[PDB]
Amino acid sequence: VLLLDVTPLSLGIETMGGVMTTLIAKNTTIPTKHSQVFSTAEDNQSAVTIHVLQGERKRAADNKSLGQFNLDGINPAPRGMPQIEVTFDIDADGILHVSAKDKNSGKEQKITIKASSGLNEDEIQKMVRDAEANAEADRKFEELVQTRNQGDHLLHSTRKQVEEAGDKLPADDKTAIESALTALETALKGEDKAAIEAKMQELAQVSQKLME
Protein backbone atom coordinates (compact mmCIF):
# COMPACT_ATOMS: atom_id res chain seq x y z
CA VAL A 1 0.00 0.00 0.00
CA LEU A 2 1.11 3.54 -0.85
CA LEU A 3 -0.97 5.00 1.92
CA LEU A 4 -2.39 4.15 5.32
CA ASP A 5 -3.87 5.65 8.49
CA VAL A 6 -1.44 6.40 11.28
CA THR A 7 -1.68 8.32 14.52
CA PRO A 8 0.66 11.20 13.74
CA LEU A 9 1.92 12.15 17.15
CA SER A 10 3.24 9.95 19.94
CA LEU A 11 0.67 9.14 22.62
CA GLY A 12 1.18 8.53 26.31
CA ILE A 13 0.80 9.66 29.85
CA GLU A 14 2.35 11.70 32.53
CA THR A 15 4.71 10.15 34.94
CA MET A 16 6.32 11.29 38.13
CA GLY A 17 8.16 14.54 37.80
CA GLY A 18 6.00 15.77 34.97
CA VAL A 19 7.60 13.82 32.18
CA MET A 20 5.85 12.16 29.30
CA THR A 21 6.09 8.46 28.96
CA THR A 22 5.15 7.24 25.56
CA LEU A 23 2.85 4.55 24.86
CA ILE A 24 2.03 4.71 21.21
CA ALA A 25 4.83 6.01 18.99
CA LYS A 26 4.23 8.66 16.36
CA ASN A 27 3.38 7.40 12.93
CA THR A 28 2.16 4.14 14.22
CA THR A 29 -0.33 2.57 11.88
CA ILE A 30 -3.85 2.24 13.18
CA PRO A 31 -5.60 0.40 14.57
CA THR A 32 -3.33 -0.60 17.36
CA LYS A 33 -3.23 -1.65 20.96
CA HIS A 34 -0.53 -1.12 23.49
CA SER A 35 -0.26 -1.80 27.18
CA GLN A 36 2.30 -0.95 29.81
CA VAL A 37 2.48 -1.52 33.56
CA PHE A 38 3.09 1.28 36.00
CA SER A 39 3.24 1.74 39.75
CA THR A 40 2.83 4.38 42.39
CA ALA A 41 5.19 7.29 42.92
CA GLU A 42 5.05 7.10 46.73
CA ASP A 43 4.25 5.04 49.78
CA ASN A 44 0.63 4.43 50.81
CA GLN A 45 -0.92 5.79 47.63
CA SER A 46 -4.54 4.85 47.14
CA ALA A 47 -5.16 6.71 43.94
CA VAL A 48 -3.52 7.67 40.70
CA THR A 49 -4.33 10.04 37.86
CA ILE A 50 -3.99 9.21 34.21
CA HIS A 51 -3.29 12.30 32.15
CA VAL A 52 -3.38 11.41 28.46
CA LEU A 53 -1.05 13.46 26.26
CA GLN A 54 -0.22 13.96 22.57
CA GLY A 55 3.24 14.96 21.40
CA GLU A 56 6.98 14.57 21.12
CA ARG A 57 8.22 16.68 24.05
CA LYS A 58 9.78 15.39 27.22
CA ARG A 59 7.89 17.94 29.32
CA ALA A 60 4.41 16.61 29.78
CA ALA A 61 3.40 20.22 29.99
CA ASP A 62 4.75 20.84 26.52
CA ASN A 63 2.45 18.34 24.96
CA LYS A 64 -1.21 18.32 24.08
CA SER A 65 -3.60 17.17 26.76
CA LEU A 66 -6.29 14.92 25.40
CA GLY A 67 -7.70 14.21 28.81
CA GLN A 68 -7.61 12.50 32.13
CA PHE A 69 -9.21 10.40 34.83
CA ASN A 70 -8.54 8.96 38.24
CA LEU A 71 -8.01 5.43 39.36
CA ASP A 72 -9.01 4.99 42.95
CA GLY A 73 -9.43 2.20 45.44
CA ILE A 74 -5.83 1.14 45.28
CA ASN A 75 -4.77 -0.55 48.56
CA PRO A 76 -2.25 1.71 50.28
CA ALA A 77 0.96 -0.16 49.73
CA PRO A 78 4.64 0.76 49.34
CA ARG A 79 5.80 2.55 46.24
CA GLY A 80 6.44 0.42 43.22
CA MET A 81 4.35 -2.41 44.51
CA PRO A 82 1.01 -1.87 42.84
CA GLN A 83 0.62 -3.01 39.28
CA ILE A 84 -1.41 -0.49 37.30
CA GLU A 85 -1.92 -1.70 33.76
CA VAL A 86 -2.48 1.13 31.34
CA THR A 87 -3.70 0.51 27.85
CA PHE A 88 -4.01 2.75 24.83
CA ASP A 89 -6.10 1.41 22.02
CA ILE A 90 -7.00 3.23 18.78
CA ASP A 91 -9.77 1.77 16.64
CA ALA A 92 -10.09 1.96 12.88
CA ASP A 93 -12.02 5.22 12.90
CA GLY A 94 -9.39 6.88 15.13
CA ILE A 95 -11.29 6.68 18.40
CA LEU A 96 -8.90 6.38 21.31
CA HIS A 97 -9.71 4.36 24.40
CA VAL A 98 -7.54 4.58 27.46
CA SER A 99 -7.86 2.16 30.36
CA ALA A 100 -6.10 1.74 33.65
CA LYS A 101 -6.44 -1.30 35.87
CA ASP A 102 -4.91 -2.01 39.29
CA LYS A 103 -4.10 -5.71 39.15
CA ASN A 104 -4.51 -6.34 42.87
CA SER A 105 -7.74 -4.53 43.68
CA GLY A 106 -9.06 -5.08 40.15
CA LYS A 107 -10.23 -1.49 40.16
CA GLU A 108 -10.59 -0.20 36.61
CA GLN A 109 -11.35 3.08 34.87
CA LYS A 110 -11.69 4.37 31.35
CA ILE A 111 -11.89 7.28 28.98
CA THR A 112 -12.90 7.64 25.37
CA ILE A 113 -11.25 10.13 23.07
CA LYS A 114 -12.59 11.40 19.77
CA ALA A 115 -10.51 10.94 16.68
CA SER A 116 -10.75 14.66 15.99
CA SER A 117 -9.19 15.67 19.28
CA GLY A 118 -5.65 16.84 19.53
CA LEU A 119 -3.42 18.75 17.22
CA ASN A 120 -3.97 19.80 13.64
CA GLU A 121 -1.45 19.57 10.86
CA ASP A 122 0.10 22.97 11.33
CA GLU A 123 0.38 22.20 14.97
CA ILE A 124 1.68 18.71 14.15
CA GLN A 125 4.48 20.05 12.00
CA LYS A 126 5.42 22.54 14.63
CA MET A 127 5.55 20.00 17.44
CA VAL A 128 7.94 17.91 15.43
CA ARG A 129 10.06 20.81 14.38
CA ASP A 130 10.05 22.04 17.99
CA ALA A 131 10.93 18.65 19.48
CA GLU A 132 13.90 18.20 17.24
CA ALA A 133 15.08 21.74 17.90
CA ASN A 134 14.94 21.30 21.66
CA ALA A 135 16.27 17.76 21.72
CA GLU A 136 19.21 18.50 23.95
CA ALA A 137 17.02 20.34 26.49
CA ASP A 138 14.38 17.63 26.55
CA ARG A 139 17.09 15.09 27.23
CA LYS A 140 18.49 17.28 29.98
CA PHE A 141 15.02 17.54 31.40
CA GLU A 142 14.35 13.87 31.45
CA GLU A 143 17.50 13.06 33.33
CA LEU A 144 16.97 15.99 35.62
CA VAL A 145 13.77 14.33 36.56
CA GLN A 146 15.24 10.83 36.79
CA THR A 147 17.60 12.26 39.37
CA ARG A 148 14.88 14.26 41.09
CA ASN A 149 12.81 11.14 41.58
CA GLN A 150 15.72 9.10 42.99
CA GLY A 151 16.18 11.82 45.47
CA ASP A 152 12.59 12.29 46.43
CA HIS A 153 12.74 8.60 47.12
CA LEU A 154 16.04 8.68 48.98
CA LEU A 155 14.33 11.31 50.96
CA HIS A 156 11.34 9.45 52.27
CA SER A 157 13.51 6.42 52.69
CA THR A 158 16.15 8.09 54.76
CA ARG A 159 13.42 9.75 56.80
CA LYS A 160 11.71 6.40 57.22
CA GLN A 161 14.90 4.70 58.34
CA VAL A 162 15.70 7.30 60.95
CA GLU A 163 12.28 7.72 62.45
CA GLU A 164 12.61 3.98 62.41
CA ALA A 165 15.52 3.79 64.84
CA GLY A 166 15.94 4.58 68.51
CA ASP A 167 19.66 4.15 69.00
CA LYS A 168 19.58 6.62 66.18
CA LEU A 169 23.24 6.62 67.04
CA PRO A 170 24.92 9.57 68.87
CA ALA A 171 21.95 11.56 67.71
CA ASP A 172 24.97 13.31 66.29
CA ASP A 173 24.50 10.79 63.59
CA LYS A 174 20.87 11.71 63.47
CA THR A 175 21.68 15.39 63.40
CA ALA A 176 24.08 15.26 60.49
CA ILE A 177 21.39 13.54 58.51
CA GLU A 178 18.73 16.09 59.20
CA SER A 179 21.14 18.78 58.15
CA ALA A 180 21.76 16.79 54.96
CA LEU A 181 18.12 16.06 54.31
CA THR A 182 17.58 19.77 54.11
CA ALA A 183 20.38 20.46 51.74
CA LEU A 184 18.85 17.74 49.60
CA GLU A 185 15.32 18.93 50.04
CA THR A 186 16.50 22.27 48.68
CA ALA A 187 18.84 21.02 46.00
CA LEU A 188 15.88 19.15 44.63
CA LYS A 189 13.99 22.33 43.83
CA GLY A 190 16.71 23.30 41.45
CA GLU A 191 17.19 22.39 37.86
CA ASP A 192 20.75 21.33 38.37
CA LYS A 193 21.21 17.59 38.29
CA ALA A 194 24.73 17.58 39.63
CA ALA A 195 23.87 19.52 42.71
CA ILE A 196 21.21 16.98 43.51
CA GLU A 197 23.51 14.02 43.13
CA ALA A 198 26.11 15.93 45.10
CA LYS A 199 23.79 16.26 48.05
CA MET A 200 22.55 12.73 47.64
CA GLN A 201 26.15 11.68 48.09
CA GLU A 202 26.86 13.83 51.11
CA LEU A 203 23.71 12.42 52.58
CA ALA A 204 24.90 8.91 51.70
CA GLN A 205 27.96 9.68 53.71
CA VAL A 206 26.68 10.79 57.09
CA SER A 207 24.34 7.80 57.07
CA GLN A 208 26.79 4.96 57.72
CA LYS A 209 25.32 4.07 61.08
CA LEU A 210 21.81 4.16 59.74
CA MET A 211 22.68 2.17 56.66
CA GLU A 212 23.70 -0.14 59.44
Partner: peptide, 9 residues
Amino acid sequence: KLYALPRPT
Protein backbone atom coordinates in the same frame (compact mmCIF):
# COMPACT_ATOMS: atom_id res chain seq x y z
CA LYS B 1 11.29 -0.90 33.01
CA LEU B 2 8.97 0.46 35.70
CA TYR B 3 7.46 3.92 35.77
CA ALA B 4 5.68 5.67 38.55
CA LEU B 5 2.21 7.64 38.50
CA PRO B 6 1.42 10.47 40.79
CA ARG B 7 -1.33 11.35 43.15
CA PRO B 8 -4.45 13.30 42.23
CA THR B 9 -4.87 16.87 43.41
